[PDB]
Paper text:
The analysis of the X-ray crystal structures of NP7 at low and high pH and with different heme ligands show the existence of a large resemblance in the overall fold, which is also similar to the spatial arrangement found in other NPs. These structures reveal the extensive clustering of Lys side-chains at the protein surface opposite the heme pocket, which is implicated in the charge-stabilized head-to-tail interaction observed in the crystal lattice. However, packing effects also explain the large structural similarity observed for the different ligand-bound and unbound structures, although such a structural similarity does not permit to rationalize the effect of deletion of the N-terminal residues on the binding affinities of certain ligands nor the pH sensitivity of NP7.
Residue numbers in the entry: 1 to 185
């Protein structure tokens, strides 16, 4: 049911960490597993890893309200090298903290597949370690690009097809690319 995080979310075997945890990723397609979650959003992020800790900068844009928000997330990478659980705060466009982390919230990202300039991730949001909801996202290095077929193969294993996803390339997305490109610089 909506609210419980999906089963059969499998971390990629032997994800190349240096490649995945670099640069900027754009969401091109997403599927919130709650069918009533129909707000249109654009998303991009810059995840980095060092010494088994992930530090990432996040960017969301609400298409309807035209309001953006910025977060950073930090947490340990699992031994499998393709899954992490983060605590997060809220920052402004200059990276200054404007709201501190709320200890009760966390999220868990699984990198399911990565191929060429494409990837497939899943996020499970939690409150006090209990599932509150989840979403799948197809990522690309290029905003307007279609995913590698390996991403579709991965979707098919969890009984999903790409046509079910929201596509954002036609939406009025506005991005802060400098916030992400300047991450940790
Ligand atoms: C890829 C498609 C994604 C979409 C469409 C999306 C959409 C959203 C929406 C609608 C909200 C709630 C905003 C509000 O309450 O007004 C939100 C919040 C949030 N998302 Fe995402 N999200 C995506 C991916 C991600 C990913 C991959 C992460 C983590 C790596 C993430 C981390 C967060 C966090 C931490 C919040 C809470 C921000 C806050 O409360 O200040 N999101 N997202």
């Amino acid at each position: 049911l909506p609210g419980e995080c999906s089963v059969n979310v499998i971390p990629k075997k032997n994800l190349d960490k240096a490649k995945f945890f670099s640069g900027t990723w754009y969401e091109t397609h997403y599927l919130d597993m709650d069918p009533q979650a129909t707000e249109k959003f654009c998303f991009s992020f810059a995840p980095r890893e060092s010494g088994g800790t992930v530090k990432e900068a996040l960017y969301h844009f609400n298409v309807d309200s035209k309001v953006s928000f910025y977060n950073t997330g930090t947490g340990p990478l699992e031994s499998n090298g393709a899954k992490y659980t983060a605590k997060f705060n809220t920052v402004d466009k200059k990276g200054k903290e404007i709201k501190p982390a709320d200890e009760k919230y966390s999220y868990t990202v699984t990198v399911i597949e990565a191929a060429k300039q494409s990837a497939l991730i899943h996020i499970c949001l939690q409150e006090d370690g209990k599932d509150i909801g989840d979403l799948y996202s197809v990522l690309n290095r290029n905003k307007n690009a279609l995913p590698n077929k390996k991403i579709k193969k991965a979707l098919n294993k969890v009984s999903l097809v790409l046509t079910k996803f929201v596509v954002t390339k036609d939406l009025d997305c506005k991005y802060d690319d400098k916030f992400l490109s300047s991450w940790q610089k």
